[PDB]
Amino acid sequence: AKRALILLINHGLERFMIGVPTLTIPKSVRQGTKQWEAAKEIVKNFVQKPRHGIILPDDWKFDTVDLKSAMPDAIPYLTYHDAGIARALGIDFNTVQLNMGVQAINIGEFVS
Amino acid sequence: LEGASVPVMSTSYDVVVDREFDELLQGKDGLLVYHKMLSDGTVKNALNYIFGRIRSAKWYVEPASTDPEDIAIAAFIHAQLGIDDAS
């Protein structure tokens, strides 16, 4: 579960961090043309060269996909499964959070 | 002087058969469910604690009386089990 969640979080973080570029162009634009290369270069540069900037004729429209919410916080579920590895061996203190966060006063009792 | 007049009887009534009402947990099919639960991390964590604490209870042998013969027989059993500080 831990391994599958790290793959899912890595993938999610790229789409919420960078954004998925969309370019809408006139029906007249055909593949293998000057205009077509320009379209591919805009989308590529959005991802690779953000400082580059985008110049559009008024019948071309650039946008990023609206995901319509904040990225879900999957850290608590990942640490549930990760710390769960140590719980399954009969360790009775959290081996992933260790000393960090609000906790029980008496750590000694959980070591006992 | 008379022996028992009442026999030992099964814990059975209506759908309850020998203490169990749920068909999926009756007999040896039941045992397969409990076996599969041993693969759960929360079950294994609990059994590790419970079974550890049971064995650590400072086991020893109490004699039937303070009579030297009862002490002698208790010492034989102590020796058979190898009673010691760590159990």
- Residues in chain B, total: 87
CA distance B42 to chain A (A): 6
Query: What are the structure tokens assigned to B11, written together?
Result: 């814990």
Contact B42 A87 (CB under 8 A): yes
Tell me which method was used to determine the 3D structure: X-ray
Q: Which parts of B1-87 fold into alpha helices (H)?
A: 27-37, 41-55, 68-81
**3-state SS string for A29-72:** CCCCCHHHHHHHHHHHHHHHCHHHCCCCCCCCEEEECCCCCCCC
Q: Amino acid letter at B80?
A: Q
Least Cα distance to A6 among A64, A99, A82 occurs for: A82
* Residue pair A29/A36 in contact by the 8 Å Cβ criterion: yes
Give residue B62's identity as a one-letter amino acid code. Answer: E
User: Which is it for the CA torsion A25, A31, A33, A36, positive or negative?
Assistant: positive
Tell me the one-letter amino acid at A26: P
Closest by alpha carbon to B67, among B79, B75, B78, B58? B75
Radius of gyration of chain A (CA): 24
From the list A78, A106, A110, A77, the residue with the least C-alpha distance to A93 is A110
Q: Which residue has the tokens 């640490």?
A: A79
Pairwise CB contact (< 8 Å): A87 & B45: yes
Shortest distance between the Cα of B49 and any Cα of chain A, in A, equals: 7
Which residues does B27 contact at the CB level (< 8 Å), separation at least 6? none
Cα separation, B71 vs A89, whole angstroms: 42
Closest CA to A40 of A87, A32, B14, B49: A32
Cβ distance B77 to B61 under 8 Å? yes
The resolution in Å comes to 2.0
A96 contacts A82 by C-beta, under 8 angstroms: yes
For residue B48, give how far its alpha carbon lies from the nearest alpha carbon of chain A (Å): 6
Give Cα separations from B1 to B6, B7, B8, B69 (angstroms).
Answer: 15, 17, 20, 31
Cα torsion through B37, B42, B47, B53, rounded to 10: -170
Backbone angles phi, psi at B9, to 5 degrees: -120, 155
Measured at the alpha carbon of residue A86, what is the angle toward residues A82 and A90, in degrees to the nearest 5?
A: 150
Q: Is B41 close to A90, i.e. CB distance below 8 A?
A: no
